[PDB]
Amino acid sequence: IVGGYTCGANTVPYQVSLNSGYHFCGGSLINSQWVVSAAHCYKSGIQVRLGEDNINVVEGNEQFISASKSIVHPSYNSNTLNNDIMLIKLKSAASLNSRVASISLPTSCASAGTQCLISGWGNTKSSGTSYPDVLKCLKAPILSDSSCKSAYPGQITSNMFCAGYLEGGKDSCQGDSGGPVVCSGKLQGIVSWGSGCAQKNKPGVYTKVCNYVSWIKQTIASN
Ligand SMILES: [Ca+2]
């Protein structure tokens, strides 16, 4: 997250870190046994880390649970990033309370102008590299589809939305991928892609979760 603020320990209780010997992607806890992330985050050998603030220090609220199964969206296209969404099932159910909690799926899509919270442990610089140890937060509005398509001609599908600032300076970044965009207490987006980070006229592009609710529910119910 570029241009954000330190969230505070366990203020974002549905945030997860995906770990394969090091943090590589974020994700969101949607119930006690399932996580949603970006398909471009796919790896074998994932451990899901819940209850994290500082990802380099054991602080006392963490739950570390291995993945038993990963399911990439059946129509994921790695060249266009269309359908950049994946589900991860945990080997055992997480223990839920105020500091580890699930986030609700949306019943409708959010409109341009809605303010949302984006969070993660990704790069905090638009030029160069600096990865934080503690979780960073950013408040950002959803942009209109027209703005979003004008910023990225020929690249925005119906499964994507833009959020952020056309002026630049504030954005998600590498390492935030897979993490949550929450608006009005519902999961509306997954950190997916962008051209660089926090560049003028190049806002973040997010997977539009409201288009996937039936797939997520059906998948959860049978696996
Ligand atoms: Ca920790």
Domain boundaries, the chain: 1-12+103-210, 13-102+211-222
Q: Please check if 188 is assigned to a binding site.
A: no
Q: Residue 98 corresponds to which amino acid?
A: S
* 84 flagged as catalytic: yes
**Same fold yes or no, 1-12+103-210 and 13-102+211-222:** yes
Q: Which of 97, 118, 129 is nearest to 196 (CA)?
A: 129
Neighbouring C-beta atoms of residue 161, cutoff 10 Å: 28
Neighbouring C-beta atoms of residue 180, cutoff 10 Å: 30
Q: Which of 32, 20, 43, 51 is nearest to 89 (CA)?
A: 32
What is the assigned CATH class of domain 1-12+103-210? mainly beta
Distance of CA 89 to the CA centre of its chain: 16
* 40 flagged as catalytic: yes
23 close to 55: Cβ distance less than 8 angstroms: yes
How far, in Å, CA of 131 to CA of 123, rounded? 5
Q: Which residues, in sequence order, are CB contacts of 177 under 8 Å at separation 6+?
A: 25, 26, 38, 40, 41, 120, 122, 191, 192, 193
Catalytic pick from 84, 119, 176, 192? 84
Structure tokens at 127: 């030029």
In the chain, where does DSSP find H-type helix?
Answer: 145-151, 213-222
Catalytic pick from 23, 28, 37, 40? 40
Report strand pairing: 180-183 vs 160-163. unpaired
Q: Which of 42, 6, 12 is nearest to 180 (CA)?
A: 12
Q: Residue 205 belongs to what H/E stretch?
A: strand 204-208
How far, in Å, CA of 49 to CA of 56, rounded? 12
Q: Which of 200, 193, 212, 208 is nearest to 81 (CA)?
A: 193
Which region, left, alpha or beta, applies to residue 196 given φ > 0 means left and ψ of -120 to 50 means alpha?
Answer: left
Neighbouring C-beta atoms of residue 155, cutoff 10 Å: 15
Q: How far is the CA of 213 from the CAs of 73, 106, 172, 216, in angstroms?
A: 12, 8, 24, 5
Q: How far is the CA of 178 from the CAs of 124, 157, 213, in angstroms?
A: 16, 18, 16
Structure tokens at 204: 């973040």
Q: Residue 37 belongs to what H/E stretch?
A: strand 34-37
How far, in Å, CA of 97 to CA of 102, rounded? 9
How far, in Å, CA of 20 to CA of 74, rounded? 24
How many A from CA of 43 to the centre of ligand 1?
22
Technique employed here was: X-ray
Cross-strand pairs, 104: 186
Fold of 13-102+211-222: Thrombin, subunit H (2.40.10)
Q: Residue 171 corresponds to which amino acid?
A: D
Q: What is the resolution of this structure in A?
A: 1.7
143 close to 162: Cβ distance less than 8 angstroms: yes
